[PDB]
Design a protein around this ligand. Structure first.
Ligand SMILES: Nc1nc2c(ncn2[C@@H]2O[C@H](COP(=O)(O)OP(=O)(O)O)[C@@H](O)[C@H]2O)c(=O)[nH]1
Lengths: 21, 319
């Protein structure tokens, strides 16, 4: 439950408006 | 004698930025070779920023000041792919400068609480002339504001005050679960980042609760986990600048309705820090080291981190 919570919440970091290498 | 630092906290809170800062301060910083590499990224982020603002005027239904410039918008989406290789066409620069100066677009930007606008947007859009030069090489600061999509686990290491620091950003890496879990193993200190300026954000279609309260629940989970009873908890209340500006206009009652205090930056910040620190349910057995950061301010981060290190050393002398 803890790790799932972490992955869920930490991932919303706006994937549009971002780029890769 | 080795020190394992783990960055946690929700998305867009400053983690990757803090890592970059760690590079700039305790590593040699970024070499001109790499700065060159980040040019395309800069142009890109600038583009997606202005685009995002435009789509936002779409959904919020806000018309331009001068309806003329609208054509550039239509043109922008076509000229959008003009960065990938290199050099933003002076034609494109004129599209951006025209759209960003438009008081109708600005009216959408000043309502960025109602949608999802990047926090690095302004930094780029205001400094457009400097970067739209063809001979442009990015400032270290320009690289700080770069937003890179994360593959998996981010990690930097450095030597400081006769100590070896290994620092991890485990965020979002749904794969490599063993290396991912090992980031949570034997942690000397967790650095939880909180974006203060997220207090006035509007409840979105996909959230159960307010964004700040999401971060709070997450902190409740982390702080009171039996595994971390012997781990120092460091709380970075970040984006203090944007919070100070926002708090002038947007009341904290937006986010904490029960808040009866005043709208001074100092009193409000204290109230938030209280709200988070109250979540420590092992209050006697564990103390929380709270700091108020502006992760884009290298000087500030350097200071705060120095202080953190000092606390660590003082905890070592205890041993
Ligand atoms: N103005 C300002 N922007 C910040 C501050 N801290 C973080 N940001 C912005 O937040 C954006 C994303 O932060 P990021 O490091 O990616 O957070 P992460 O997703 O948790 O790793 C960046 O564009 C930063 O410019 C701050 O103190 N002031």
């Amino acid at each position: 439950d803890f790790f799932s919570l972490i992955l869920r919440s930490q991932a919303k970091r706006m994937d549009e408006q971002r780029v890769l290498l | 004698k080795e020190v394992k630092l783990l960055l946690l906290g929700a998305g867009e809170s400053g983690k990757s930025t803090i890592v970059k800062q760690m590079k700039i301060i305790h590593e040699d910083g970024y070499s001109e070779d790499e700065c060159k590499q980040y040019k395309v990224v800069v142009y890109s982020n600038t583009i997606q920023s202005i685009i995002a603002i435009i789509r936002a005027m779409g959904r919020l239904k806000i018309d331009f000041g001068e309806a003329a410039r609208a054509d550039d918008a239509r043109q922008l989406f076509v000229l959008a792919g003009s960065a990938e290789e290199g050099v933003m066409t002076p034609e494109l620069a004129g599209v951006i400068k025209r759209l960003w100066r438009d008081g109708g677009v600005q009216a959408c930007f000043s309502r960025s609480r109602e949608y999802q606008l990047n926090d690095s947007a302004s930094y780029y859009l205001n400094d457009l002339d400097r970067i739209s030069q063809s001979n442009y090489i990015p400032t270290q600061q320009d690289v700080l504001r770069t937003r890179v999509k994360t593959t998996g686990i981010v990690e930097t290491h450095f030597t400081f005050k006769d100590l070896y620091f290994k620092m991890f950003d485990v965020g979002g890496q749904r794969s490599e679960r063993k290396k991912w879990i090992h980031c949570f193993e034997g942690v000397t200190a967790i650095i939880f980042c909180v974006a203060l300026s997220d207090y006035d954000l509007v409840l979105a279609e996909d959230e159960e609760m307010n964004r700040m309260h999401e971060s709070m629940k997450l902190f409740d989970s982390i702080c009171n986990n039996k595994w971390f009873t012997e781990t120092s908890i460091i709380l970075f209340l970040n984006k203090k600048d944007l919070f100070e500006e926002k708090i002038k206009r947007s009341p904290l009652t937006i986010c904490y309705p029960e808040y009866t205090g005043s709208n001074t930056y100092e009193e409000a910040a204290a109230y938030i820090q209280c709200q988070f620190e109250d979540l420590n349910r092992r209050k006697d057995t564990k103390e929380i080291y709270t700091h108020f950061t502006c992760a884009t301010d290298t000087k500030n981060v350097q200071f705060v981190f120095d202080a953190v290190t000092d606390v660590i050393i003082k905890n070592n002398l205890k041993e």
